Structure formats: C-alpha cells, structure tokens
Amino acid sequence: YGDTWAGVEAIIRILQQLLFIHFRIG
C-alpha cells in the first residue's frame, strides 16, 4: 500500500522538468 507511486514518479519525472526549463529559460 504505497508502491503505485512508481507510476506517479514517471509523471513527475517529466512534469516540472519541462516547466523548470521552460521557466528557467523563459
């Protein structure tokens, strides 16, 4: 009861990563 987070982690892995670069640059 706490392993499905591995799916979530796949989302976060590309979530603010694109935003941080869109924002850090833009």
Which pair of tokens denotes residue 2?
């706490």
- Domain enclosing residue 19, as ranges: 1-26
Q: Cα(12)–Cα(1) distance, rounded to whole angstroms? A: 20
Coil, strand or helix at 9: helix
User: What's the CA gap between 20 and 15, in Å, rounded?
Assistant: 9
Give the C-alpha separation, 15 to 10, whole Å: 9
5 Cα distance to chain centroid: 12
Q: Provide the Cα torsion 5, 10, 12, 15; round to 10°.
A: -150
Q: How far is residue 21's CA from residue 26's CA, in Å, rounded to a whole number?
A: 8
Q: Under the phi-then-psi rule, with left for phi > 0, alpha for psi from -120 to 50, and beta for the rest, what region is 2?
A: left
Domain count, the chain: 1
